[PDB]
């Protein structure tokens, strides 16, 4: 039985014998729905996933350079020039430098100096587009206790899904995938097997060398200068040196961005949020007021308190009169046995006709002292329980 | 002849027939010293250099991790533990994580979780000490025109040096190596063949994994955590991932630090500054009032204006009466030939007794119009010259 250990757990109560109830489904969270004359159910947003993502743009964050060449001109002798100046495998820089008799020119003044160097990208990061046609939310439904579990796929192009639950009938989901998370201002950035969701403008403003799309043969790198610094201009040459890898720098610049992961070709996100409408007219308790279980239960574990104050118990049943209705309640007075608190796991049922079957119950005790009571008459079990509120 | 093309050029005039003159020697700069009845001289701080530098501390800036192991404990069941927790080849992290029936524990609460992973450093940067015993300033002296050139080595442990200049006698240097640059608050940092001088505290504050000195076998890396982030703690495990290379980050953090270079094992600096006392009693014009050159000169180049307003000329001489005293002056009136302006290259001399020898002169013209005059009588050369001040 799920949701019990989950920290981010909501409790939603139904309305009368009403059709619908609204829920907010968050990632790594769980919603427990309870309605009168309904089996208690568990809704969980398990995985948001994005397939078929299109490479929008790549940025080089580590490069190397070699084989530099320079051209210099004397004052009044024009612009310096190299063939490789417009060669896409090279990065260049024009500047001015002091010239005189000391270095070959017949007059003392600024001369033109160009320096080019072979450019090769070692590593790059890639920003991909996210279109709602390939977005897909995975939701798991589990009856509260016991094909009593279903998994459904809510997409922005199909926000309505129905899920059958065996002898409990079926539940219906109408979710708003629009109000989930905004992916028209977001890119899927990957860099050395680390993955984030980033904002489009921020991504476009990234001052690294770039190309669009990853075409074949040779990617044409724009703005190679960004990874290469030119220094110490002499009369006839100029020193070129790469900056470091800007990987850690980017990672630091992504300290507070949504983190995602990869799985095969499909991205998997964990920034879950999903408004949903739960339709519960076709949902039913196993529709048989069964005979109460006659034989005696026993605790397989001492009853434990969940983070939310509720109490989980697990019992083993010694009868073969299954399927039978489990007698379970809480009482302060052991004479009148007045039912206090309630059951999260509503109307529990032993469904197995073989002895020594196990059942989990989640009860919602009142404050102060109380007794967990399970069974009928003489062999019924009791267990002392205190609920200190906090 | 040096200094002419140099942008950072100082002009220091002597005093009477005085013993000393004070100069400030900067890197890539030059000082031209002129004293009456002295040959004009050129002082240049060429290279500051540091040998035998001792590794103070290394910082890892790129690493990799693999083979992670985790240990987790149920609530009230103690502290998690792994053997590798204290193993120096591993990086670990302790944390707490939600536990309950859902993941093996019999009670709902925080459990202890430790995760360790093999740690390997890919690349590192090294900070070395700089002791004034291995600091060494290289100074070049060149007579203004013409073993007329010397190179001397000023060290903090020998700030006094003497340099002979052939038939010009000798010059003496007493420098203050203390007031040069402060290297007791500086480290020599190298990182991927890039080199800076950095401040000690800043270097110590660098939050990267570190070790002292580079001993053999296996360096013990302190603070490995700095290159490794732990994420998304589950009940029984926890994801570990390296940050990027912090190379570019460091480079960015060094935008405004003194940049240096390497040469063999010896560091070479370019942040030159050196106060010096020039002793000039033993310095002499070639001590012979020679006969004036009788034959005729010719311009090998049109006279050019230096960045400092002065004018360089080069002449070829057609006589064999060398060694002889070059007749050179400037005049506004070509009748009285009144000497105007002066000569930087003071008392120029043809020293070669073979015809067609070359000589460079640097003259200091007055403002407005003037005539560069070189030679005697009929075959003397004139050249019109304007000095517009700026």
């Amino acid at each position: 039985i799920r949701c019990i250990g989950v920290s981010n757990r909501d409790f939603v109560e139904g309305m009368s014998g009403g059709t619908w109830v609204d829920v907010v489904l968050e990632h790594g969270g769980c919603v427990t729905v309870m309605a009168q004359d309904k089996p208690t159910v568990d809704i969980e947003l398990v995985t948001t996933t994005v397939s078929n993502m299109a490479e929008v743009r790549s940025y080089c964050y580590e490069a190397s350079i070699s084989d530099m060449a320079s051209d210099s001109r004397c004052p009044t002798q024009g612009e310096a020039y190299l063939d490789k100046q417009s060669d896409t495998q090279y990065v260049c820089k024009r500047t001015l430098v002091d010239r005189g008799w000391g270095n070959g020119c017949g007059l003392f003044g600024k001369g033109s100096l160009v320096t080019c160097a072979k450019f090769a990208c070692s590593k790059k990061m890639t920003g991909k587009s996210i279109q709602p046609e390939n977005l897909e939310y995975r939701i798991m439904l589990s009856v509260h206790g016991s094909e009593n579990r279903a998994k459904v796929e809510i997409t922005p192009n199909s926000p309505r899904a129905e899920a059958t639950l065996g002898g409990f009938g079926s539940l219906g989901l109408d979710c708003e995938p629009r109000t989930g998370l905004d992916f028209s201002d977001l890119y899927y950035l990957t860099m050395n097997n680390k993955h984030w969701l980033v904002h489009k403008e921020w991504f476009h403003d990234i001052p690294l060398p770039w190309h669009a799309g990853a075409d074949t043969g040779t990617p044409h790198w724009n703005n190679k200068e960004a990874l290469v610094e030119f220094k110490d201009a002499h009369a006839k040459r100029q020193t070129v040196v790469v900056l470091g890898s800007q990987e850690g720098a980017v990672h630091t610049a992504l300290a507070g961005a949504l983190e995602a992961e990869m799985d095969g070709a499909k991205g998997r996100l964990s920034s879950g949020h999903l408004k949903c409408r739960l339709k519960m007219d076709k949902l039913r308790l196993k529709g048989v007021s069964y005979s109460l279980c006659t034989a005696a239960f026993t605790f397989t574990k001492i009853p434990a308190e969940t983070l939310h104050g509720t109490v989980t118990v697990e019992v083993q049943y010694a009868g073969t009169d299954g399927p039978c209705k489990v007698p379970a309640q809480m009482a302060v007075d052991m004479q009148t046995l007045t039912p206090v608190g309630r059951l999260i796991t509503a109307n529990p049922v032993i469904t197995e006709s073989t002895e020594n079957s196990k059942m989990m119950l989640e009860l919602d005790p009142p404050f102060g002292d109380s007794y967990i009571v399970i069974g009928v008459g003489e062999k019924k079990i009791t267990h002392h329980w205190h609920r200190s509120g906090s | 002849i040096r200094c002419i093309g140099v942008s950072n050029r100082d002009f220091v005039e002597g005093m009477s027939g005085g013993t000393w003159v004070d100069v400030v020697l900067e890197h890539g700069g030059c000082v031209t010293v002129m004293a009456q009845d002295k040959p004009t001289v050129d002082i240049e701080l060429v290279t500051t250099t540091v040998s035998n530098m001792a590794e103070v501390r290394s910082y890892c800036y790129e690493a990799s991790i693999s083979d992670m192991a985790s240990d987790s404990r149920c609530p009230t069941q103690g502290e998690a533990y792994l053997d590798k927790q204290s193993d120096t080849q591993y990086v670990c992290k302790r944390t707490l994580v939600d536990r309950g029936w859902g993941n093996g524990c019999g009670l709902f609460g925080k459990g202890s979780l430790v995760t360790c992973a093999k740690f390997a450093c890919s690349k590192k940067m090294t900070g070395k000490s700089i002791q004034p015993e291995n600091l060494e300033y290289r100074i070049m002296l060149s007579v203004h025109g013409s073993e007329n050139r010397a190179k001397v080595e000023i060290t903090p442990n020998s700030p006094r040096a003497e340099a002979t200049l052939g038939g010009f006698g000798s010059l003496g240097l007493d420098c203050e190596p203390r007031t040069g640059l402060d290297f007791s608050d500086l480290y020599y940092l190298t990182m991927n063949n890039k080199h800076w001088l950095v401040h000690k505290e800043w270097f110590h504050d660098i939050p990267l994994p570190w070790h002292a000195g580079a001993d053999t076998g296996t360096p013990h890396w302190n603070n490995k955590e700095a290159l490794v982030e732990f994420k998304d703690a589950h009940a029984k495990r926890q994801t570990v991932v390296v940050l990027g290379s912090q190379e570019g980050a460091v480079h960015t953090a060094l935008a405004g630090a003194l940049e240096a270079e390497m040469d063999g094992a010896k560091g070479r600096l370019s942040s030159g500054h050196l106060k010096c006392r020039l002793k000039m009693d033993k310095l002499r014009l070639k001590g012979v009032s020679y006969s004036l050159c009788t034959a005729a000169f010719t311009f090998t180049k049109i006279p050019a204006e230096t960045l400092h307003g002065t004018v360089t000329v080069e002449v070829q001489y057609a006589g064999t009466d060398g060694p002889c005293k070059v007749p050179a002056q400037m005049a506004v009136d070509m009748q009285t030939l009144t000497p105007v302006g002066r000569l930087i290259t003071a008392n120029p001399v043809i020293t070669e007794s073979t015809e067609n020898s070359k000589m460079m002169l640097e003259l200091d013209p007055p403002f407005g119009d003037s005539y560069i005059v070189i030679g005697v009588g009929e075959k003397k050369i004139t050249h019109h010259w304007h000095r517009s001040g700026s």
Partner: antibody
């Protein structure tokens, strides 16, 4: 990974033209790699002749740039060297070679073919 | 054009000896220098790459150090298979240029 094999006539008339071809197998010649010609006169040292990228872009040794042309044939996965107006100074063992992708120096070499210049 | 001068030109050493070959560049090359081993009849093979970087398939007894204008290939423990002639190559400046080469013989 990749294998390089040179082929061409081992004899060239003085003032004639040396032609050599390097056939690359195991990998495409259109990878992010520069391809070089290097040579070595017998009993002497190595001299870098020239260089080409699959884009057709070339770099030649200045000492002999006026006489070399280097080209590519992606169709047959090879590249070629023309060296004109040869003298006995062009008598050497010729190697084709590859650079690695971090622009790093020769990471692969051919077997080497001797070419003599003689009448 | 940057000139690369190797020293010595030739060298005779016993097995197990430490051999130091020096390379000097007329201009600064940073660390863009490589070391190659040429066995007779065969093409040269890369031993080292960015002045320091030991390459795959090459025993760790080969090592490179230096920067700027001064570099050193050290072979720590000489072996019979190390009889060869070794070259240094600068590729910091177009055109790339080799040193004259250093021949390593063996004493036995």
């Amino acid at each position: 990974q990749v294998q390089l094999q040179e082929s061409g006539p081992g004899l060239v008339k003085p003032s004639g033209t040396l032609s050599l071809t390097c056939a690359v197998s195991g990998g495409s010649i259109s990878s992010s790699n520069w391809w070089s010609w290097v040579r070595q006169p017998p009993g002497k040292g190595l001299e870098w002749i020239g260089e080409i990228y699959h884009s057709g872009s070339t770099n030649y040794n200045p000492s002999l740039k006026s006489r070399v042309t280097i080209s590519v044939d992606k169709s047959k996965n090879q590249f070629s060297l023309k060296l004109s107006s040869v003298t006995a100074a062009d008598t050497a063992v010729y190697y084709c070679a590859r650079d690695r992708d971090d622009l790093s120096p020769f990471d692969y070499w051919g077997q080497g073919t001797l070419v003599t210049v003689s009448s | 054009d940057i000139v690369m001068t190797q020293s010595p030109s030739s060298l005779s050493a016993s097995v197990g000896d430490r051999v130091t070959i020096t390379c000097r560049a007329s201009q600064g090359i940073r660390n863009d220098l490589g070391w190659y081993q040429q066995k007779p009849g065969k093409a040269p093979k890369r031993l080292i790459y960015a002045a320091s970087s030991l390459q795959s398939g090459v025993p760790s007894r080969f090592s490179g150090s230096g920067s700027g204008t001064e570099f050193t290939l050290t072979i720590s423990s000489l072996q019979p298979e190390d009889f060869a002639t070794y070259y240094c190559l600068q590729h910091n400046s177009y055109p790339r240029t080799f040193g004259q080469g250093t021949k390593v013989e063996i004493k036995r």
